[PDB]
Amino acid sequence: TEYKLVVVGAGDVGKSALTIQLIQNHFVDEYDPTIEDSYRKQVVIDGETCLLDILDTAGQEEYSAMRDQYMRTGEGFLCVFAINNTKSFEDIHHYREQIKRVKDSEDVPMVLVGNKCDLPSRTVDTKQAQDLARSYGIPFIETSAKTRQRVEDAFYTLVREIRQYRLK
Amino acid sequence: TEYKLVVVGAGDVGKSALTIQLIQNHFVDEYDPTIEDSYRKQVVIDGETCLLDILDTAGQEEYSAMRDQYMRTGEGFLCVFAINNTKSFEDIHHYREQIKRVKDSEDVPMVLVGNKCDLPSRTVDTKQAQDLARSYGIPFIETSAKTRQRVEDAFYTLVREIRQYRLK
Numbered sequence: 001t002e003y004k005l006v007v008v009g010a011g012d013v014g015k016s017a018l019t020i021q022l023i024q025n026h027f028v029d030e031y032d033p034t035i036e037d038s039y040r041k042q043v044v045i046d047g048e049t050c051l052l053d054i055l056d057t058a059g060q061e062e063y064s065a066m067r068d069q070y071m072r073t074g075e076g077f078l079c080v081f082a083i084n085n086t087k088s089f090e091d092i093h094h095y096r097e098q099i100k101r102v103k104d105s106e107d108v109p110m111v112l113v114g115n116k117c118d119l120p121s122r123t124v125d126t127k128q129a130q131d132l133a134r135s136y137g138i139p140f141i142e143t144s145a146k147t148r149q150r151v152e153d154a155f156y157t158l159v160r161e162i163r164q165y166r167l168k
Numbered sequence: 169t170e171y172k173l174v175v176v177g178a179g180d181v182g183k184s185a186l187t188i189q190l191i192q193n194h195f196v197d198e199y200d201p202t203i204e205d206s207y208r209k210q211v212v213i214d215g216e217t218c219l220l221d222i223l224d225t226a227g228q229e230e231y232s233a234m235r236d237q238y239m240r241t242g243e244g245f246l247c248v249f250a251i252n253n254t255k256s257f258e259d260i261h262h263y264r265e266q267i268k269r270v271k272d273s274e275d276v277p278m279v280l281v282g283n284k285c286d287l288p289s290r291t292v293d294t295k296q297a298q299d300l301a302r303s304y305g306i307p308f309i310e311t312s313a314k315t316r317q318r319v320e321d322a323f324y325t326l327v328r329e330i331r332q333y334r335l336k
């Protein structure tokens with residue numbers, strides 16, 4: 001039932017920062033007196049209960065056995081790069097292709113995110129990213145976790161993509 | 169083929185500290201000229217290629233959709249508590265029971281670890297832990313990631329447990 005979001009992308013692009021910001025304003029204390037302590041947190045986005053996972057192959061998942069399992073379990077993917085990191089943008093295709101392979105489908109809920117849009121030191125232009133998103137058939141959003149710009153929007157977009165996919 | 173180790177336990181018991189220490193002295197640069205860049209890191213413990221994963225339900229996996237998948241993929245479990253944290257010891261049974269349930273088996277390679285054995289502020293006695301390990305049928309090891317005591321031993325023990333299990 002819950003929407004399973006997975007944030008993917010190169011290391012140091014702001015996956016953790018984005019997810020923490022989102023959770024900060026979206027967690028609810030859910031009351032259930034038939035469980036220990038009675039109050040578990042859950043994340044609710046655009047009126048949907050969401051589960052959230054970060055696939056971090058640069059850090060926490062470098063020596064991991066779980067990469068393909070994150071991709072099989074995940075329902076929608078936020079593919080993140082940083083606007084000051086050309087390599088992180090170049091890495092998007094590899095992640096996208098992986099997910100496509102694992103899920104064995106051309107149609108996966110995905111949103112492309114260019115993070116750190118507050119930085120003056122841009123090397124990835126909006127148009128480059130737009131072209132990429134358009135090739136994939138997916139939305140593109142620029143975000144900044146530092147300044148809190150379009151963070152909720154990116155997650156909201158992905159939720160909506162998953163909602164549309166589920167209606168098929 | 170590779171040994172899939174999963175470190176489980178309450179938050180702040182030293183799972184990350186233990187795993188980082190282990191990796192520090194066990195990673196090898198593996199040369200393979202048919203791949204990009206030619207040199208991927210791998211972890212080798214007791215002459216076995218290992219993959220390493222931390223299940224952290226207090227942090228990185230609190231809102232996660234992946235708990236049961238970590239347990240299904242994992243082959244051996246390092247169950248960690250801290251000797252100054254009574255609650256973290258009380259939580260071991262819950263983790264153990266979860267893994268048993270997910271894997272549908274009484275026989276899972278497991279090692280019980282009491283971490284932070286360098287601390288003077290003990291509330292879990294060695295005998296308590298020994299009794300627990302003995303009930304489970306598994307080794308118990310006290311460790312300190314801070315002072316670097318028995319860290320390799322704990323992982324070596326779990327590797328050996330997995331080796332024995334695989335020989336069945």
Ligand SMILES: Nc1nc2c(ncn2[C@@H]2O[C@H](COP(=O)(O)OP(=O)(O)O)[C@@H](O)[C@H]2O)c(=O)[nH]1
Pocket residue numbers: 010011012013014015016017018056115116117118119143144145146147
């Ligand atoms: N200027 C700026 N820095 C950011 C932004 N998001 C994250 N960072 C920083 O980038 C680094 C990597 O962030 P982190 O969330 O750890 O990236 P992850 O490795 O992809 O999870 C940290 O220093 C963050 O503070 C952002 O939108 N703008």
Ligand SMILES: Nc1nc2c(ncn2[C@@H]2O[C@H](COP(=O)(O)OP(=O)(O)O)[C@@H](O)[C@H]2O)c(=O)[nH]1
Pocket residue numbers: 178179180181182183184185186224283284285286287311312313314315
């Ligand atoms: N004294 C002491 N502190 C430790 C030890 N291992 C970890 N810590 C500290 O305990 C805290 C939690 O460690 P961390 O690895 O983040 O725990 P995790 O949440 O289980 O991954 C940090 O402040 C670590 O530095 C240890 O063996 N001894």
Ligand code: NA
Pocket residue numbers: 057058059060061062063
């Ligand atoms: Na790493």
Ligand code: NA
Pocket residue numbers: 225226227228229230231
């Ligand atoms: Na958390």
